[PDB]
């Protein structure tokens, strides 16, 4: 929120040269001046016979605003033979990748082509040039003896580049191995020490590189983007690369070990063609000293209010925990076709609040589709999803979109103001903009009134105009402000004082300043940075007694303060900015003495009473929890009376009750400021004598830890009086209860088997599943619908195996689904066959007993039983033409709950499944 | 190694050819067959066969005038990459 | 009497109308102070004010034209008008609503022009052969469904630039297939060859004149071709009065947007047509591939139906791609393109099987509600579409339009239209907020002469501090305790204290943390309820006690959506017909069913019990599902009476049941992968003998 959009640094290269396609800082150790590195592909150079070779210009902050191209190659095409070039170098897009460590500059040409030195070809291998001081080497790891598309010929190395913490580059190329992609990592010293101008294919020691994979991984574009950061405990920066076309164009992001190039973690986009992985970045966004992942999907389509798809793009924010897998949240875009996640750029700690901040840019959104850059501040809880500042493109769209924000770079303090700054490139208008951060000043102001209670008959001070004693009081406004970075010693604050802010344009004033004789006043103040909370005084003479008829209305003293733009730095127009979320004003209230007894002080007796309409609160779901509050003041008036409702972590307060007349409305607001959650309700200012008020507050509880017996609610009344200002804190609790609606269901598939079986013959010893009979399938489901869950339960199955020493339903096999184990008291499928009412009573009984694990609300346990109707036993002699109803029952018993130290006391039910065989 | 090693003629009755190659080790996407007119101005022509079929048929030749037949194997990579042109003269 | 308008409502003529749609204002040409100021026209009328001085605008849903739904849309007089009505005039007062209806019909014979977009990479050489006479073969099949047919052809390979294009050796530029020892033509981005014409032999003439090219990377850019064939309607010749079908035939993967950065192409695709007189997509090398969103937008605007005709190896890729482009259908294409002639007819059936309304240029100040009537008389609330229809059916939709407040936006109109159709329902919305008596405007000094006041519609609101009909209301010891009207109930506090009573008008003080309004300072902002700690869930304005939910939000807390897309299952039915859809979440009704769309019910009866209800009403013409006339809507399965219950049990279920004739019927249920489900029925069931 502290970026200056008024006077930024504008830079412009030649038109048509994509000036700004890639930007970075340059902070050499050899000097104190810091520079800008702006790549410019498609730029015509002095290279002989090379058209649009591309440049990387060095722009300075010396206020001359002049960019000088950096000499990297300066030579034309080397020759494989006479009139047979080895390289082509034209339209090579040199400068599309620019990244710089302390004193070294790395630029690449992803569209550089090669002759391959074996046959006559033009393969976009890509090349890079690493420059350190005067020496300049060529780093082309993809220019090797692996030639064709199955090799590295189309790799386009240098498409995305980066440095690690200790002198090691991370290079990506999307065209290796039929466009599978590749990551190549090399030591900076190895790149310089092993360079040989007479060797085109150089092998480096300690080169980490990904290898070719199965053909199903083709056309994945690994190495499209690169980011570095530590994701294990090794301390070495690991490799992060986006794979936008991976997994059927779902998009993936790979994380390789920065030590032995082994897979560490993964990410996958939820939507196809969203280009999940177009942009990646790694930063500690929560101050945890653990790097967090950021992934851009510019073409992600979300759902609007209507529900139709709209392309707004989303950014994947993954917080790394010290234990393992990340905590991933989503951040959708704002405008359609804006491509919100096209560029993700970390910028140090922008506001210097102790947590790093990041910037996400939509190059094609905003007014006239000029481009928007959003700034997101980090917090203790992670990344704040609400943007704090928007940066708008300022240039036209002559030929192509300006693409303001297509490339960004931060986390470097180009001036000495102590705050990191940001570079934004356009490349559509061939321009780059530098935004400098402004210092942040956190200011707190106090307001006091001597005294807070006024007596009209107690006139002491003399009016300046005519000598008459007037009732008076004092008001003091102290002001202290400080901040970090470079900001001036003394700050110019302009403060305004307003007496009786409540009454306004049409009303009585009731209070004016002593000398000015006016209800308002202004003061020019000037304080110092560290401490020294300066104050001033003008004293508040009260109006003539018994002249306004309006008492019981508190005279609210209101102070608002601004900051004059006078004091700034030598930065030529970079003025500070106050803290983001800080009150620009503060109010105090005085009261006229009225009905405070013969002691001239109002001593009330506040009381809180709450009964329990609700009795039980069930674990596992939200539920209405209404509390009835009875606030009464038996005593003299209580100034600024408020009801303080301290709530637990599970409260989630919502609204107040309106539908009753026995309890009236109230003015309540949820707020948490200092280490505690609570609900404050206004009880009248002042809350006069008697005043028995009834009200209700609604809550929906999300229980905690599954072991708590109750939930805590402490209530009391507070006031501004000097004596007996509060009420006895009254606590009310409601017990957590366990309720679990568990049901058991069953069904037969099919529920009918007509006789005779078509095309059936009897084998005396069959193993067919066909010579036995039709397949009868019983499915039993134990489902827990109730809010509370249970940890252990027992299920008993009764199966009519035989009847008069012959089989009824030969069970082939049974399967389980969910947290359950089962065991049959008789061996299932003993014959190794491979693919009126007869119950488990009068007939032979086969039991299957099961143990059930933890079942929550949305989960159940299912037992599939595939059996065979033994056709031999039916239809033969004793059961020739008779209707039999094969009956199987199943009962369950819940025996344990995870909520120990709480009443449970039972759960049990049962059901039965029937399979009727009939004749005709 | 990306080439089948087979395809000597089978079923030489009609004014056609029935050739049969044998299982290249690498996965095969398609098969390409060319034919015609060894020593003349070469009216060459082709047709496509899916990689699961190991046989093909040709048409439109003279009464056994000793054509030349070639077969290609198509890699499942890129748009259309191939190689290994095994040939026979029949 | 005092319902809502008499008290808490009397501010001015324009504010009286904004309180409730039932309020009314009067200018009675006299001064019977009383309370005939702003009141219901059943009470204000009894207050003896009706020389047409009553201002009570009524919300109007008048139709401006409604042509009858035609029967056959080919040939004769004019104006097929497959949508009725066409233009209606909506007139709404603040915070009011009216409702209307719309009927759409798939005409019996509607002209169809189909454009063949074909991949010409080397894997399609076999396909280009068998498509030689499939132009006239497609003529005879489409002649049955449509008498007026048009066909056109288009070609695409990929972007002709590295790394996609064979750039070297120079010996292979006119012949990108050089190592193959054959000859192909140089590759092209998109090539339009034959414009839409009614000569089916002309199609076969341009075919076999085309030849096949070669590319280097497997993803072939056809989205460039799809985008151009859609927005170059002038070049290719889309009939503005015919059904547009664009068939996309390819066997490999496709390039998506942002893939062109490898080739150095960083300019986003624009929805503009760039195919020139050379019939080649000129911007192919300079412009990136189009995204799904931009393709969806222009596909809907040009009313083009995109048909994906791809092979089984890549059909699942285009299945998921089509899910992101609603209204498009995918079909299995044989390796040699021998199935395209049948696949086109099958796709046109699916396209004409559904009707879904789309809204364009809708002002966000008003929201639309939908009750759909797809079946005979059964209404489906919340739905704006109908599924499972045959050509000739007619469906109905009822729509309600409600406004939050009322703007002065100059009566902008909007469109309601089914997707892919030319005919549409245009709604002209008008807002009548202000009163007709404001035109006179009676500026300052008529009855509030000095201390400049005003006069408007029979009342005076005089200056900053003076108040009431009579005036000066001044800021000094002027001391009325007003009475009994600054508070109701005869004994309540003074003006429900936020600001006190000064001369009775209750100038509400303590204006902070929101504004305080209302005649007794009764109203305010920020006084609504919370759901997750956010007031009205952030989805509704707070109007003095209550949330005015934004568009597509309903309920007291405005936390209930009107979206039915999250309720939609994969088969098409919302919640699989096993439960209702409330606030975008299903609530299953069938016992033992659960899940997001109630798709999981392991304890439900098998398919034998469900599918036998069709074989009863379809084959025996009786039983349930017949008396409701819903037999041949829910029963889309192919049924054929056969014998012996054949052997092929790849994935099938044999089902036996006893009908009311006390006979045993046996049938089967089979399906091809991701296709249709057919029903075999054994003829001559078993009945009791003798
Ligand atoms: C994040 O996502 C990444 C993206 O998927 C994950 O990377 C992937 O991890 C997979 C699991 O390790 C890995 O699958 C393994 O691949 C290797 C490849 O080596 C092969 O060596 C052979 C000779 O060169 C060839 O494979 C033969 O066999 C395969 C069948 O497996 C045939 O299809 C081939 O035609 C060929 O005949 C290949 O050329 C290839 O170079 C395999 O060796 C592994 O085999 C393992 O499984 C078999 C049983 O199926 C075991 O017998 C054997 O001992 C191995 O354990 C795996 O198939 C993917 O290749 C890899 N992909 C990429 C792009 O990196 C990453 O793991 C994930 N990380 C996390 C943390 O989630
Ligand atoms: C929008 O917000 C309101 C208020 O926060 C929600 O109202 C609550 O809705 C539930 C049902 O969803 C009501 O029923 C309560 O939940 C249990 C669950 O088992 C039910 O069995 C009981 O009947 C119980 O009353 C609840 O009373 C109601 N009010 C509360 C919690 O204060 C509403 O559900 C929200 N809507 C959406 C779509 O989020
Ligand atoms: C770099 O110089 C080349 C010189 O060829 C420029 O290319 C020519 O640009 C003009 C107008 O833009 C065209 O009419 C010519 O056809 C181009 N030449 C060729 C061979 O096509 C190029 O525009 C220059 N680029 C920059 C950024 O200055
Ligand atoms: C009567 O009024 C005087 C003056 O307004 C009060 O004396 C002030 O007391 C406050 C602290 O309570 C001091 O900050 C002021 O400086 C005092 N003003 C003076 C001394 O002029 C006094 O407290 C009031 N009440 C009495 C006298 O009972
Ligand atoms: C089902 O049987 C398993 C095997 O004995 C029980 O043990 C679980 O799984 C492994 C053994 O493979 C143990 O090391 C775990 O400690 C067990 N897990 C849990 C959650 O207890 C398992 O407990 C049995 N489950 C039930 C419901 O009876
Ligand atoms: C769609 O049908 C529903 C059916 O309920 C209509 O709902 C209205 O709102 C009340 C509130 O419950 C219902 O009880 C009534 O049936 C309806 N009110 C009436 C008819 O005055 C809804 O209005 C219908 N919408 C449209 C656009 O027709
Ligand atoms: C459904 O029909 C019969 C069940 O009676 C099964 O019959 C098989 O297929 C044919 C047709 O009857 C015959 O060859 C035999 O009766 C059976 N096959 C063999 C090899 O014996 C048929 O399989 C059943 N199909 C399903 C899916 O249940
Ligand atoms: C790679 O990562 C670390 C080496 O620092 C080690 O813990 C791990 O086992 C290594 N694995 C392989 C396969 O090299
Ligand atoms: C005073 O600060 C509050 C926030 O604390 C802000 O809402 C208000 O606009 C400021 N100015 C006033 C009350 O004049
Ligand atoms: C089987 O017969 C019993 C007899 O009481 C009946 O209750 C049950 O519903 C029948 N099962 C069927 C028809 O599936
Ligand atoms: C068992 O379930 C039935 C309903 O299926 C219910 O009426 C009965 O009260 C339940 N009994 C127990 C002990 O859960
Ligand atoms: C609104 O109700 C139905 C549809 O819901 C509609 O047909 C009818 O004309 C409307 N009624 C009124 C009174 O506007
Ligand atoms: C298509 O989507 C479905 C679910 O959305 C998924 O199961 C399937 O794997 C997807 N197919 C492909 C090829 O991605
Ligand atoms: Mn590491
Ligand atoms: Mn972190
Ligand atoms: Mn920060
Ligand atoms: Mn700075
Ligand atoms: Mn007292
Ligand atoms: Mn292809
Ligand atoms: Mn083909
Ligand atoms: Mn391609």
Numbering used by the authors:
A (entry chain A): 1 to 835, 870 to 954
B (entry chain C): 1417 to 1506
C (entry chain B): 1 to 690
Excerpt from the publication:
We traced this unexpected effect of a ligand to a stable, key π–π stacking interaction between the indole derivative, W1496, that immediately follows the RGD motif of hFN10, and the β3-Y122 in the ligand binding βA domain of αVβ320, a conclusion supported in a subsequent molecular dynamics study. We therefore substituted S1500K in hFN10 with glycine and replaced the ligand R1493 with the longer L-homoarginine (Har), changes that we predicted would not adversely affect FN10 folding or the π–π stacking interaction between βA-Y122 and W1496 of the new peptide Hr10. To elucidate the structural basis of pure antagonism, we determined the crystal structure of αVβ3/Hr10 complex at 3.1 Å resolution by soaking Hr10 into preformed αVβ3 ectodomain crystals (crystal packing of the αIIbβ3 ectodomain does not allow access of large ligands such as Hr10 to the MIDAS). Hr10-Har1493 forms a bidentate salt bridge with αV-D218 and a cation–π interaction with αV-Y178 but does not contact αV-Thr212 (which replaces αIIb-D224). Hr10-D1495 directly coordinates the metal ion at MIDAS, with Hr10-W1496 making a π–π stacking interaction with βA-Y122, stabilized by an Hr10-W1496 S–π interaction with βA-M180, and by a hydrogen bond between the carbonyl oxygen of W1496 and Nε of βA-R214. Bound Hr10 prevented the activating inward movement of the α1 helix (reported by β3-Y122) toward MIDAS, and the conformational changes at the C-terminal end of the βA domain that normally initiate integrin extension. Superposition of the βA domains from the αVβ3/Hr10 and αIIbβ3/eptifibatide structures shows that the S1500K/G substitution removes the predicted clash with the αIIb propeller. Thus Hr10 acts as a pure orthosteric antagonist of αIIbβ3.
When activated by several agonists, including adenosine diphosphate (ADP), thrombin, or collagen, platelets adhere to the disrupted surface, and aggregate upon binding of soluble fibrinogen (FB) or other proteins1 to agonist-activated αIIbβ32. Previous studies have shown that the three current anti-αIIbβ3 drugs are partial agonists, i.e., they trigger large activating conformational changes in αIIbβ3 that enhance receptor binding to physiologic ligand, promoting thrombosis. Ligand binding to β3 integrins triggers tertiary changes in the A domain of the β3 subunit (βA domain), comprising the inward movement of the N-terminal α1 helix (reported by movement of βA-Y122) toward the Mg2+ or Mn2+ ion coordinated at the metal ion-dependent adhesion site (MIDAS). This reshapes the C-terminal F-α7 loop and repositions the α7 helix causing a swing-out of the hybrid domain underneath the βA domain, which converts the integrin from the genu-bent to the genu-extended conformation, separates the transmembrane and cytoplasmic tails, allowing formation of the integrin–cytoskeleton interactions that mediate dynamic cell adhesion.
